[PDB]
């Protein structure tokens, strides 16, 4: 299924995913598309800091979602 990841510049990027995928492999796909290293990224949804070692189905992220990505530094 498709979800959207809205960053802070007005650009929306997309991906087709399944709820059983880990957050790490989503980050790897984003790294494949935009080149941004996973460890610098910080995905946030509904005020809670989304952890890496859970699954996509753990945060109830469904098809047609608006997810916020802020960038952090090491």
């Amino acid at each position: 299924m498709q979800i959207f990841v809205k960053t802070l510049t007005g650009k929306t990027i997309t991906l087709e995913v399944e709820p059983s995928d880990t957050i790490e492999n989503v980050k790897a796909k984003i790294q494949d598309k935009e080149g941004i290293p996973p460890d610098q990224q910080r995905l946030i949804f509904a005020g809670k800091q989304l952890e890496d070692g859970r699954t996509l189905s753990d945060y109830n992220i469904q098809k047609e979602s608006t997810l916020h990505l802020v960038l952090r530094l090491r």
């Binding site: 802070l8 510049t9 935009e34 610098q40 802020v70 090491r74």
Partner: protein, 302 residues
Amino acid sequence: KLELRLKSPVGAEPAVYPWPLPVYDKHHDAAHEIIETIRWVCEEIPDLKLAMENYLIDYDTKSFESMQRLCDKYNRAIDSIHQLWKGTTQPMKLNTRPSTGLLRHILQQVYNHSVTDGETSFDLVAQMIDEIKMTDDDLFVDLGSGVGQVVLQVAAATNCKHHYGVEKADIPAKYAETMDREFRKWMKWYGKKHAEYTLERGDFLSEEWRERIANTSVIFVNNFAFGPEVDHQLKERFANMKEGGRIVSSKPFAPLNFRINSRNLSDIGTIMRVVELSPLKVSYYLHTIDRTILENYFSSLK
């Protein structure tokens, strides 16, 4: 003993000056504050300046009688103005913000009253006000506020929701407590508005202060002598600030000719623009959080 009394124009507590006048420094005494106070109030009120024109005079600051005479003339004029306001004349509009000359005079008055025995000058702060224009969304904190006069000037000149000052050293924080009270007292005396403020003691590097700094939109920090350890911790705490926040400091946190590459990825410079502030007719530097630059750099690598 001998006493001088000036009535408040809004019927607040009178301003009291002891005789003999306390010495402030080699070039400053209380008579100077008194004469500038009279001059600036006459500036505040054209009617008072009119009244004071009729009987300018050679003030002899050495003689008590001469000063008591002028003070009597002033107090009677204050009386007559209150009668004028009882008549048809519109009284002075209350709780407007003071003019620039008034803000320098009030801050000078609190200063002269407080430092009985380094400080950023009023003019640089005023330049800073001129160039970073604050609105009602912004929240300002001087980390290491010294005697607090930057915080007071901004609190007196803008309409932010709240201002804070934090001072570590006991003596200036102590004087700042008196500064707060003397400012509020004189402010009641002149009947002028400023926004709300509190100067608190504490260490801004604590865990608690992390969320406050994180939620602060404008930081001023005179970090020139802090050293690498404090500066390092400050970089780390600025790195949590919200989009569009601004930090003005006296020593840049990133070099002016910064270019993002794959080697400089952890320098604070990747998330901020830096421009050097115009000199006043020493140097201070504005950093603005703009994360679109990193995104741009990544889009260009593809």
